[PDB]
Amino acid sequence: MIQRTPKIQVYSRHPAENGKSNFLNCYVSGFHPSDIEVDLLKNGERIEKVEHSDLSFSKDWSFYLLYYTEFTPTEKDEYACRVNHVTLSQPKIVKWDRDM
């Protein structure tokens, strides 16, 4: 019996270009159990239309999921992913950095 903390990567589907429509991604993987809370944030507010791929898991039985929304990045608008999970002491906020 094991519980695992999620890995979190925040990134865009395509290279960001100001004024150009894209997809904002939050990939959460390596976690157990499967119950997880994932929110995408625009300047700190939860984005409402966030979809996600079907839950699946890998060789070591740990789960992975992609959360995503459509967005058009700008110069100042801040994006981030917020994750909560039973193994986490605190909700984790990972901010979107457009070169990562």
Binding site: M1, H14, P33, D54, L55, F57
Partner: protein
């Protein structure tokens, strides 16, 4: 080499009642069906275009099989809680992976049929498809019951028969999608570190399948032992991305080359920033 694989998760949730039950099928690491007990009318559903040619008998039978499996998993979650003597109000997880790996000639390469309870190996069908690896006493108890029930014989019938047959049918029906290759598109970025050196980051975007090798070289010698490398991650449109970076002296960036190897490339890519 090709594979058909089903990934099944059942999660008990006392107080809201019946377990969440899921079922995701992959062909060669490509999702093509799903079942979710939390749907309003839960049923097997296509998640790839090519599986939609299947007649309604296929969809009706898979829906019923998932719902039947859900029943067994509800019982198994109660059996497990008792055998491990766990507290009654908690949520628990039974996972199951089953499937077949086959060569092009249709020979079975490996059949799988294995389970995990709360994240750890519980019981697993061995590669001979006759014997079970049972992790602890509860799973050893399960194994004795499955041995005297002839389960391995009959799971092996699925893995050698119906699993290979359906895989072979799926590769004909989904050939243009599954055997597609999408080559990486690559670029190198640069950012000054506060330490006074430079990060060179080599991106690979838009590639499929997910297997890829990124390496940095300094005058032709591999820098595996000095690079950073993210987990390969889905882009969301069916392709994958990855990057690898090295920290280099300011002024020596042009000596460093990124190497991208992918099945979709006719010759590996070589990129520089200076």
């Amino acid at each position: 080499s090709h594979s058909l694989r089903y990934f099944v998760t059942a999660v008990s949730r006392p107080g809201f009642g019946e377990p969440r039950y899921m079922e995701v099928g992959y062909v060669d690491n490509t999702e093509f069906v799903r079942f979710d007990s939390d749907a309003e009318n839960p049923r097997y559903e296509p998640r790839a275009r090519w599986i939609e040619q299947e007649g309604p008998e296929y969809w009706e039978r898979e829906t019923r099989r998932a719902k039947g499996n859900e029943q067994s998993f509800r019982v198994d979650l109660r059996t497990a809680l008792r055998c491990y003597n766990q507290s009654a109000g908690g949520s628990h997880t039974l996972q199951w992976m089953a499937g077949c790996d086959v060569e092009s000639d249709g020979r079975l390469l490996r059949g799988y049929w294995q389970f995990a309870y709360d994240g750890s190996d519980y019981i697993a069908l061995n590669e001979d498809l006759k014997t079970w690896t049972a992790a602890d006493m509860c799973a050893q108890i399960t194994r004795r019951k499955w041995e005297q029930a002839g389960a391995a014989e009959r799971d092996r019938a699925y893995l050698e028969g119906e699993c290979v047959e359906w895989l072979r049918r799926y590769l004909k029906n989904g050939n243009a999608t599954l055997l597609r290759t999408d080559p990486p598109k690559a670029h190198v970025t640069h950012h000054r570190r506060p330490e006074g050196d430079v990060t060179l980051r080599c991106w690979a975007l838009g590639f499929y399948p997910a297997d890829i090798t990124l390496t940095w070289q300094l005058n032709g010698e591999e820098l595996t032992q000095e690079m950073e490398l993210v987990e390969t991650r889905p882009a969301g449109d069916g392709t994958f991305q990855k990057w690898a970076s090295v920290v280099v002296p300011l002024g020596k960036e042009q000596k460093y080359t990124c190497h991208v190897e992918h099945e979709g490339l006719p010759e590996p890519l070589t990129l520089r920033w200076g």
